[PDB]
């Protein structure tokens, strides 16, 4: 793995403090930290977790299994930005997740949005940019839960997915990063946590 900077302690700080079991406290802004930097650091880690979580069930999610992006039959997702695609496009769950993951990555590699220099302020619209990222990442949990959960449990990956989702939901709730409207696919699960 990666071996051995402020955002990086912030990350290892966030990961380690989760081990107290009390996720509501662990997700809170540490004393005197930049709110944007805290959100940015956790947003990246969430992208990485959800990227590897989906990567474990990748072989069961196919154009044949999932002809549309679904969180149950009550919710379907079509891809748009818009920059390259401004009108939402019906596509498969693997293709859609590709577009979403490539797009999240593209924003993470954008130094105007996520400055890698430690003294450069985050943009004024950063808060809006991060809310859009996390809102779409949630739909990757949503599709895995509603469709590929048998595969998640066939692999030993249930606790991984559950702990990461709990962490994700508590973080999103603490900072007001996602509306009820968007969390409705996982409603019953979010109430139980």
């Amino acid at each position: 793995p990666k071996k051995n900077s402020h955002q990086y302690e912030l990350l290892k700080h966030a990961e380690a403090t989760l081990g107290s079991g009390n996720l509501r406290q662990a997700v809170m802004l540490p004393e005197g930290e930049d709110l944007n930097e805290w959100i940015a650091v956790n947003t990246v880690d969430f992208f990485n977790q959800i990227n590897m979580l989906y990567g474990t069930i990748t072989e069961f999610c196919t154009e044949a299994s999932c002809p549309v992006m679904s969180a149950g039959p009550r919710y379907e997702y079509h891809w748009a930005d818009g920059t390259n695609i401004k009108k939402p496009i019906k596509c498969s769950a693997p293709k859609y997740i590709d577009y979403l993951m490539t797009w999240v990555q593209d924003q993470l590699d954008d130094e105007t949005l996520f400055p890698s220099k430690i003294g450069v302020p985050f943009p004024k619209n950063f808060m809006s940019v991060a809310k859009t990222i996390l809102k779409r990442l949630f739909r990757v949990y949503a599709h895995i839960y509603h469709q590929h959960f048998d595969s998640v449990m066939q692999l030993q990956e249930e606790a991984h997915l559950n702990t990461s989702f709990k962490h994700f939901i508590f973080f999103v709730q603490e900072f007001n990063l996602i509306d009820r409207r968007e969390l409705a696919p996982l409603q019953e699960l979010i109430e139980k946590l």
């Binding site: 919710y75 379907e76 997702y77 748009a80 968007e182």
Partner: peptide, 5 residues
Amino acid sequence: TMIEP
């Protein structure tokens, strides 16, 4: 973006 049934 997000469609219902």
